[PDB]
Symmetry: C2
């Protein structure tokens, strides 16, 4: 056990040992790339999943074998015979929480603030997009009000999800053997705009849905809750969009994959007894390995992204890389408070009374608790070792860490640092706070609702398989079943979500090995106590909330992105 220390404070012998360890780690953690995504060349055996991990994962897969044995779903590309069949896919699995109430407009809307992807909704200011021609008459008919759109917008009552980021997807293709002939079909993509309003007990309510980006009163009209089944179908497409942005942007890109350069830089530039390495590595546990499983089984040819998502694998990969690049180029701007403020849903986005324009936002409140607790944690921890900015500046290993991260072949994190150089303790506190928050809380918030909201296929199908029907046509059960995924791909989606949610590989603030520094043990203990308080506070709030939001309870938050 070696006391952590800054390299400039070590002896020449100690410094040479640090440099030898760094050389060996650079040999073991080499940089590689898959379709432009930075990954590791060869996973070190020390970075593999543990035996315990493998036992839990295997338990999940075997449970899926049993559940499939007890299920009546078939290995065919036909639709389900009945919509009710979707509720019979879980004979030996937990029932997804959204299953009973997914048709409800409020349950649809609340997934924007407490579902798997609570990262899209933004407050409308000035006007709606010109390609989203919602009219005063529509708004007044829906809200049963005399208020106009401009008055609602001026009051901060209107919110929007604009899935334009999917407009350029090449639709995915699928094929299968039927009666000795190969059948080839194409998925139907959509990039909807969804208008919500805060209705003051107060609830977020869906107002309008335009399924595609370019308006037309006949072929791409604005649907409202007054359009019955058509409205229902509209929501499906909206949900599909929210799913594709969830997996490509919010889950894979902006947790799993943007963490890879930080793990690799930590190995490539920080000695084992560097305080920042000691701080961060518990929050990298199994991250490289789970990202190798993402390479092998998710974003590979024939994998889950190919099978399930709306676009071709190439299109999905394009979306992922764009999300990564925007995150890295503006790293500091994706800190939780700034990210919330940029969408107009931060804690400072209040009306004249001081009340938030979006008062019900469980992800925001709980994630803010976790963010501030983490910030105090890394500030005190780093204060144990950095007292003057000169120690930051003269830490050659830390400087090489930054330089590796912003370099084009080390992650290209051009938004990581100001003035081209890391110079202050507080900037490092922000960096480490954001890394730890992403690895634990954020990944928990986007990963673990996947089963409750996405293993029940009709609530959030990862692709749609037929075009939106004409606004005047009659909608039968067969129409909806033809839009929803066929049996085999619904099975594959349940398979995926169950594997991604089966267990918690670790726990936030509880590393496998204690800190060597007793002072660091104290700071970590304080972090654990604060997590206890946060757990109690969230339990209280969940007593108050319309529905409990459990995904950011500290006991449900892993220490690292690891599943």
């Amino acid at each position: 056990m070696v006391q952590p220390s800054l390299p400039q404070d070590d002896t020449p012998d100690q410094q040479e040992q640090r440099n030898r360890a760094i050389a060996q780690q650079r040999e073991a953690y080499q940089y590689s790339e898959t379709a432009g995504i930075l990954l590791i060349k060869t996973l070190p055996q020390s970075e593999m999943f543990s035996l315990k991990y493998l036992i839990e994962r295997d338990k999940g897969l075997v449970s899926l074998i049993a559940n499939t044995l007890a299920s009546n779903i078939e290995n065919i590309f036909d639709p389900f015979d009945k919509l009710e069949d979707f509720e019979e896919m879980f004979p030996l699995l937990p029932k997804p929480l959204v299953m009973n109430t997914f048709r409800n407009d409020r349950v649809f809307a609340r997934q924007r603030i407490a579902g798997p992807n609570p990262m899209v909704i933004e407050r409308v200011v000035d006007k709606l997009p010109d390609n989203f021609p919602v009219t005063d008459a529509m708004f007044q008919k829906i809200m049963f009000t005399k208020k106009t759109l401009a008055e609602a917008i001026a009051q901060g009552k209107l919110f929007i999800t604009n899935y334009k980021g999917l407009a350029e997807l090449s639709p995915g293709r699928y094929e299968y053997q039927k009666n000795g002939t190969l059948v080839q079909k194409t998925k139907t993509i959509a990039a909807p705009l969804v208008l919500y309003a805060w209705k003051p007990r107060g609830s977020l309510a869906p107002i309008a849905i335009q399924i595609n980006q370019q308006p037309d009163p006949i072929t791409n009209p604005i649907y409202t809750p007054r359009d019955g089944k058509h409205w229902f179908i509209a929501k499906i497409f909206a949900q599909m969009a929210d799913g594709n942005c969830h997996e490509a942007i919010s889950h894979l890109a902006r947790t799993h994959l943007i963490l890879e350069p930080f793990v690799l830089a930590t190995a490539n530039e920080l000695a084992p007894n560097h305080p920042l390495s000691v701080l961060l590595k518990p929050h990298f546990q199994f991250t490289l390995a789970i990202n190798e499983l993402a390479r092998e089984q998710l974003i590979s040819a024939g994998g889950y992204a190919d099978d399930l998502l709306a676009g071709t694998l190439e299109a999905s990969i394009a979306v992922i890389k764009a999300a990564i690049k925007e995150y890295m180029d503006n790293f500091t701007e994706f800190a939780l408070p700034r990210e919330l403020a940029r969408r107009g849903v931060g804690i400072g986005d209040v009306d004249q009374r001081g009340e938030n324009f979006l008062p019900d936002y469980p992800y925001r409140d709980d994630a803010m608790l976790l963010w501030n607790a983490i910030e105090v944690y890394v500030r005190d921890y780093l204060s144990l070792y950095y007292q003057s900015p000169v120690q930051i500046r003269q830490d050659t290993e830390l400087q090489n860490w930054v330089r590796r991260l912003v370099s084009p072949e080390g992650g290209r994190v051009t938004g990581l640092v100001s003035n081209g150089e890391l110079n202050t303790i507080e900037a490092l506190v922000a960096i480490a706070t954001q890394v730890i928050f992403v690895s634990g809380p954020q990944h928990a918030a986007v990963n673990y609702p996947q089963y409750d909201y996405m293993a029940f296929i009709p609530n959030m199908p990862l692709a749609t398989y037929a075009t939106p029907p004409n606004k005047e046509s009659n909608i039968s059960e067969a129409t909806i079943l033809n839009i929803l995924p066929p049996q085999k791909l619904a099975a594959r989606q349940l398979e995926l979500m169950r594997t991604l949610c089966v267990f918690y590989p670790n726990r936030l603030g509880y590393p496998d090995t204690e800190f060597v520094d007793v002072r660091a043990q104290q700071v970590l203990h304080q972090f654990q106590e604060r997590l206890q308080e946060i757990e109690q506070r969230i339990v209280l709030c969940n007593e108050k909330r319309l529905e409990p939001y459990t995904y950011l309870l500290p006991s449900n938050v892993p220490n690292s992105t690891s599943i």
Copy 2:
């Protein structure tokens, strides 16, 4: 990294470093036990499965999800509706090779010499067991001959599989909910005796084959409740074969597979870690053949011999009974370790290469496991001798190797494996004794485990050929047998599904390959020895390919390209 060296040949500083490494290894490889079975306390991360291994295993399990999705089998304890339903369990999996011909008496018999458990059959000497009252009239009726039992025995024509090792099994219990009430049922135990005869004339072709003569389903004879069945008994003979196959499968998994490959290897891995320096030549020789062994044995503890695991669900006895059988097999093996070397093990069953008639030909000429396994044993023996002779020239080096002597003492000790049959005179004193030991360990880890592990899918994933348990009593010899009778004897749908699941996972890929370690020997002489071993393995592969061109059916499980480097699945 370091050139391999004996510890007494090192400087005091180098010896200090060896002792430090051994101390840390002792801290990381601690001894533990589950139900009296020696295992590791906590697996070091360096001993975990690799990422590639996990990817392959996950491919297996997901493929099982897909095959289950495409199948019509249900999650119920009801029997199948039709026997043909057992042929429908593989819509997205390879068809087990035995499936189409499992009813044939010669296919049943040849699994004694080329199936998953080619380890039970022995040549009958002097007489049959007194509790197995086969008569001259039965033998003459089935063989269509005037020859007597005594004459056939004197000619070495008769062989037997006696499953008395299962006679004390407590039958396993199972239960389930049907119409809102709990149904509790018990499996049926059998410990059969099976009499075979070698037919040189065969079927009129210039070939020979074992043929089944008689089956007594249980050990204590009775003309009414435990009679001797023969091929003349129609459906009753088919059922008798089902019970004999169930017994052979239980002995296979408990004795031949789990006990005498996986579990007897654990003390050698642990002793290598606990007593041998990283640069010790014996450790460098043995560790490639231990890759993933501790890990897969932790999976065996967790998912096989655990409560609710595969052994609890599928095997004939209770989990406690199966564990008793496993531990008895382990103890006999360790007590007579040298006597379980392949040539000696074959000789003790009267089916060794020296078991020949007056014409020089073997009493059991058709024994693919023996032929190919002998090739691999001899090749490994040459490899081990030539490797060890690079480091041990005179026996004094053996005796003065403190680490090797500690390795032996650890192995023979009650807490380190109880391998009381490992050495003579209480001490390892000669080079050739270490050659025999290392040869046997490598043979077990690679070839033997291959021979008992990889036929599991071809012969045991088709349930009716070898069900791991039977679920009804053998019908009375005079009773009429319907399809529902046989379906009630065969496993219910859920447990048949579980058996397919298991066999598929156990046979889905090769974690490594015999003679191809992940990292080369630093000693160029040792690497040359290894290269010669690889060329010998290619020669053996071609020889086996020719033999298979001449055999009744190919025997592929001991092709060196199909033999892993370690027991690892």
